[PDB]
Chains A and B, each alone.
Chain A
Amino acid sequence: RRDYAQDRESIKTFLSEFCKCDDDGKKEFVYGSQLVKLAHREQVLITIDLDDLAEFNESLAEAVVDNCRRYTSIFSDVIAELLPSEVHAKDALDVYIEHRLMMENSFPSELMKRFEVGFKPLSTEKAHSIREVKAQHIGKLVTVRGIVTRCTEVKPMMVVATYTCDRCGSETYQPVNSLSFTPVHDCPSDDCRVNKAGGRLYLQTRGSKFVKFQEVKMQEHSDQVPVGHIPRSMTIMCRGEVTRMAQPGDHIVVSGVFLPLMRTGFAQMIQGLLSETFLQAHRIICINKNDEISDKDAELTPEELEELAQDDFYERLATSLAPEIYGHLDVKKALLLLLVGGVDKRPDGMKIRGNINICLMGDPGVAKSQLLGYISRLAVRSQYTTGRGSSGVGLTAAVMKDPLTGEMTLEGGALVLADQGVCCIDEFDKMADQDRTAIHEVMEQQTISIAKAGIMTTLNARVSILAAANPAFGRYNPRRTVEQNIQLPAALLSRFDLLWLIQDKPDRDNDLRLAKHITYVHSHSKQPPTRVKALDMNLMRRYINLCKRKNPTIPDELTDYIVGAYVELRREARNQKDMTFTSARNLLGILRLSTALARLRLSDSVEKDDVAEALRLLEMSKDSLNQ
């Protein structure tokens, strides 16, 4: 329909006649700045935005969006043989080319790639959805948002493979762009022509190319899936210089071109003219939980100082966590201790784990699943599962074929990936019988031993654990005791730092309090009125991260009394014969909480009153049935 000549001149004019003066100090050539940047051998891929091509022309402002495959290759050979501006031996490919001509069937300029171009639409055009890519999205560079899943690692793709007969020194060019091909016969040359002087040519990657070639799987948002449907997926082939531009768990926004795919093979199942398509892209601007929306890619001090001195309190950060009810204040703050932690060292070679793991016991209506489902959202890199929501292999590693290689590698479960954070579990008792050993193993941290292949199954899990389960028929029968009313492994009950049971007996005036508390969750969408300024989650995210980097010392001036505190601890529970267990690991636990609590001081000034809260914390953690 359109021409390849005046169009060529128009795009050259665009390349040159371009000093788009968006503001003051813009009187030079933007694409000419990019040109000399190519001349630096610094930049190797230009990104393009419609505003330039919005103001220049209109054809190719709408002509390239549907094809994207010709005008780019014209752009390629346009700039490939434009040398307006050394050194030769700097790039491994170019230095191998200059090896090969310093040593000295025409070479293409496709061999000397040496620079690329992508695109960048204007106004991430819109969030077009993986479902709605209907029968008009062939070739069109469409903007869409998806969800990442099951990423693999960088692989080198090939474009041009050269042989050499070794009898005529032939340097053949056998370029390839698909997946499969075959090389050429022994002598497809003229010196090595039908004349008998022929050997057999052989490949040399030296004067050949390779390319970054990453592959991942792409799953749906699970927010716009149909009402009675199931999540779908699509495949990625992110080429060029964007390999390693996604991670498992990034709500990414990918912009590229849909294309078809020919899985060449058996002409009956395949070869049915059914088009098992796939995707192509250039630009990965992940708008959710990536380098863009999350800064520091939290330690940036100046931007937060204005709010830092703007407030000075702790409980203000306390009840800002799940602030839609009232009650259970002392649980939330210590839970916030779980997010930070921050006690790391290598003392005497032995590494100490600083991830608190606590449970929730007793559930005649407490909102047990609420704190878990909330903090698993706010807590970056969280998960959630239940008793029969997953088998043992669902929690641990697994196996699956690999589209990158097919190595049949191991992929892990929820706990396999939630390390350096907190994996949430609910209703622990009915999880499984052998599962208790599976959670017994994390108490010797960074140790996930499996018998899947049963060889080593080594793995480094550095996760916390947010446990929560229910009592059996009844809730502390008048004669029953711990390990009697509960039917959990008491050895498992031993390996925690804080045990947490939540029992609510009738309180004739607290019920009306919560009734007016939660009923206002429904007439509107915000609980705390005019009594304190609960903090935004987003500022919470950085305010927690800044506290982590202190790693204070320990006060010897109170070490003399921390042991006395352990004395009164182990004695006032020991005054009776058969109270619940009181463990010798308490002194290894009390040290681990006061540190993270001082982390939010960011001061290395752990004080005598610092543990004064921890003492009552463990004090009430037990003796929860006295009244």
Chain B
Amino acid sequence: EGEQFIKDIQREYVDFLDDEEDQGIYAGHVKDMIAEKSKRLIVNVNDLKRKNPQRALGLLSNAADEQLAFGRALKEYASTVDPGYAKMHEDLFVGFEGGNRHVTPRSLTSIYLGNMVCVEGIVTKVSLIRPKVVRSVHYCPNTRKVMERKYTDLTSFEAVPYPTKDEDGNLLETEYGLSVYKDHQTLTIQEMPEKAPAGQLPRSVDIVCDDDLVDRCKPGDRVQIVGSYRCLPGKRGSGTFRTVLLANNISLLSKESNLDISREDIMLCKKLAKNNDIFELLSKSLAPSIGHVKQAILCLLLGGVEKILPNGTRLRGDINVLLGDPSAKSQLLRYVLNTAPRAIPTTGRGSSGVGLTAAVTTDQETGERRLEAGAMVLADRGVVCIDEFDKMSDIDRTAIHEVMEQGRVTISKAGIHASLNARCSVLAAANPVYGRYDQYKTPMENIGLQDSLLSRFDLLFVMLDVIDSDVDQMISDHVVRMHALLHGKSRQRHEKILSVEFMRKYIHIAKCMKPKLGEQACEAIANEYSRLRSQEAVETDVARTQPITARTLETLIRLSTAHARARMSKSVTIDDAHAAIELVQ
């Protein structure tokens, strides 16, 4: 027990416990009476300033033991309120939760030391886990007194700290079971970089965590955090200085469950579902800044549908498509990176890690042997885009064949046989070998790659640009329209019924349902596939009818499934058939 003000500080955090606001709400039915047992209470600094400013901004200036005093006061309180759950005799760290100073990883700059502050950056390096060494209820049969000894280190509190031949030489059976342990973790953050000056390199940070907070996202998302600063080691007293962060609660800033989702928003969705001609709207929703597809790109944004059998096998449910000369195909994929979740562009020139790892490690603090990640499992249960496809090498393509079609990734990097679950889709971009060409010579052989992929993909297709002398003034009219609010109220609309946010919020239920097939798809699909393989190869189109297989069925069923999710009609109809199939023809 150091300086006597520490205990004034204990009672001053007790001085939060006056009346209904905290003596009523914040303590009691809060974790253990409600029996969630997530030890960390929820603090908000603003109320602290509104009660005790010297104890509010004493915290965001120093945190020597104010956390520990918060915890001491909490156990003193709950021991009175409900001692039954007072059996977790540890520190019980708490929130400090809640724009005073929110500088970047680039600007955690030689100050804020001894402060508790805010950071933003990239979810990255979702990394390895270990447990922690606390205190152990030793024992000696010769004397039969179960003594104790607590162990510390700097990353938990200030001070720094197994017994053998303790008293004079008597027995020591180190009793585990009543010896306790936290959970421990280490990972990092990177600046969300597009605030960068690209004359400079976006900088980095270092963060450490603790028990009931562990490993709460995947590397490749965006996040907020609010934590404190510590710096232990030698610094020419022996060699310079380093950083680390703690004292925080987690904040991911890309979810929907973050939204207060009551039974009313679903009610608006299901009310408006009855409106039939909404598909043509949602097609004209996605790309309000560009003619031109997206009726189906939507279905690609709906993942797919998974179908298994008893103790047999399983299938992949999702769709993959693409078709075009230069000049709005290399600007229609950024409707995915920043429209919808888990979207990762790739290069068109990048090797050795689309799904590879290289597994390289170099004498880790612990025994990290061999592993790195890839660029598909990041996109599990969603989507991928690429630009400049055809110029990709012919190396990693076959990995795409495998992991697309088989719907599982069961690979090895020469050290370890590996298996996982990556069940995603992908796009890319397109370029013919000879520039401005798809029509006079042939439709095919203007693309130049294996005819195996169109089975792996779905579509042999076409995309071009010009017009003759009559409609050229009509494209002039549309181009000048592209080059306000008038007459997009002739487009009977609202910026809340057609938007980005509500459009995103129609994810949850369309992906939670399982709109089973009835029966009346069957004769239609069969007769149509018959006509398809029969007479698609005549009248100027014989050579553009090669890639048909018995794979248009799984695509058709993917399509009617997806279209059955955009209005949640727990059934499937002929109108869904038309709206799903007219693309193929």
A residues at B contact (CB < 8 Å): 1, 4, 66-70, 73, 134-135, 138-140, 149, 222, 225, 227-231, 259-260, 262, 269, 272-277, 324, 363-367, 369-370, 373-374, 377, 384-391, 393-394, 398, 400, 413, 427, 430, 470, 472-474, 504, 506, 508, 511-512, 514-516, 518-519, 521-523, 525-526, 537
Contacts and interface: CB of A to CB of B under 8 A. Distances in A.
Given A274-B366, A275-B181, A276-B130, A225 B420 contact: yes
Nearest to B357: A230
B130 A259 contact: no
Given A275-B130, A388-B398, A525-B309, A364 B549 contact: yes
B415 A386 contact: no
Contacts of B311: 537
A506 B533 contact: yes
B412 A394 contact: yes
A277 B131 contact: yes
B307 interface: yes
B177 A519 contact: no
Given A389-B410, A518-B553, 18 more contacts: A1-B146, A70-B175, A138-B179, A228-B378, A229-B218, A230-B371, A231-B420, A260-B131, A272-B153, A274-B184, A369-B406, A386-B406, A427-B401, A430-B398, A508-B534, A515-B553, A516-B522, A537-B311
Interface stretch (B106-114, B431-439, B524-532): B524-532
B360 to A, nearest CB: 15
Contact of A273 (B133, B211, B521): B133
B419 A222 contact: yes
B82 interface: no
Interface in B538-580: 547-551, 553, 557
Interface in B357-411: 365-367, 371, 373, 377-378, 380-381, 395-396, 398-399, 401-402, 405-406, 410-411
25 contacts: A1-B178, A135-B131, A135-B211, A139-B177, A149-B417, A227-B380, A229-B218, A230-B371, A230-B373, A259-B176, A273-B133, A274-B184, A275-B130, A384-B410, A386-B401, A389-B399, A394-B414, A400-B415, A427-B398, A504-B550, A506-B533, A508-B530, A511-B533, A515-B526, A519-B521
A237 to B, nearest CB: 15
A473 B549 CA distance: 15
A514 B552 CA distance: 12
B522 A515 contact: yes
A274 B401 contact: no
A398 B414 contact: yes
Given A515-B529, A519-B521, A389 B411 contact: yes
A227 B180 contact: no
A461 to B, nearest CB: 17
B414 A388 contact: no
A275 B133 contact: yes
Nearest to A141: B177
A537 B311 CA distance: 10
Contacts, number: 197
A400 to B, nearest CB: 6
Contact of A4 (B144, B380, B517): B144
Contacts of B146: 1
Contacts of A398: 414-415
Interface stretch (B190-198, B448-456, B468-476): B448-456
B54 interface: no
B310 interface: yes
A364 B545 CA distance: 12
Given A364-B549, A389-B399, A393-B414, A273 B177 contact: no
A102 B208 CA distance: 63
B178 A273 contact: no
A9 to B, nearest CB: 16
Contacts of A514: 550
Interface string B46-74: 00000000000000000000000000000
Tell me if A's interface is mostly helix, strand, loop or mixed: loop
B380 A365 contact: no
B144 A275 contact: no
Nearest to A274: B130
B177 A66 contact: yes
B381 A227 contact: yes
B246 to A, nearest CB: 16
B313 A373 contact: yes
B308 interface: yes
B504 interface: no
B183 interface: yes
Contacts of B162: 262
B519 interface: yes
B181 A135 contact: yes
A138 B181 contact: yes
A67 B176 contact: yes
Q: In the A-B complex, list the 10 residue pairs whose CB atoms are closest, starting with the nearest.
A: A365-B549, A139-B177, A67-B177, A515-B526, A228-B218, A139-B176, A388-B398, A512-B526, A135-B183, A66-B177
Nearest to B314: A373
A428 to B, nearest CB: 12
B132 A324 contact: no
Given A70-B175, A398-B415, A515-B529, A523 B519 contact: yes
A430 B395 CA distance: 10
Nearest to B451: A473
Contacts of A374: 312-313
Nearest to B378: A228
B585 to A, nearest CB: 16
B421 interface: yes
B480 interface: no
Q: Most chain-B CB neighbours within 10 Å: which of A67, A138, A367, A523?
A: A138
Contact of A511 (B313, B380, B526): B526
B461 interface: no
Contacts of B548: 364-365
A515 B366 CA distance: 56
Contact of A523 (B130, B179, B517): B517
Contact of A386 (B307, B310, B402, B419): B402
Nearest to B214: A134
A1 B144 CA distance: 11
Interface in B496-535: 516-519, 521-522, 525-527, 529-530, 533-534
A370 B401 CA distance: 15
Contacts of A526: 309-310
Contact of B183 (A70, A134, A149): A134
B131 to A, nearest CB: 5
Nearest to B186: A274
Contacts of B525: 515, 519
A522 B398 contact: no
Contacts of A516: 522, 526
A506 B538 CA distance: 14
B335 interface: no
Interface centre among A68, A386, A526 (most CB of B within 10 A): A386
B151 interface: yes
B175 A69 contact: yes
B173 A70 contact: yes
Contacts of A135: 131-132, 181-183, 211
A373 B410 CA distance: 12
Contacts of A275: 130-133, 181
B141 interface: yes
Contacts of A377: 312-313
Contacts of B35: none
Nearest to B412: A394
Nearest to A222: B419
B153 to A, nearest CB: 5
Q: By CB atoms of chain A within 10 A, which of B309, B313, B414 has the most?
A: B414
A430 B141 CA distance: 69
A272 B307 CA distance: 49
A269 B366 CA distance: 7
B412 A522 contact: no
A150 B399 CA distance: 26
A115 B141 CA distance: 23
B127 to A, nearest CB: 11
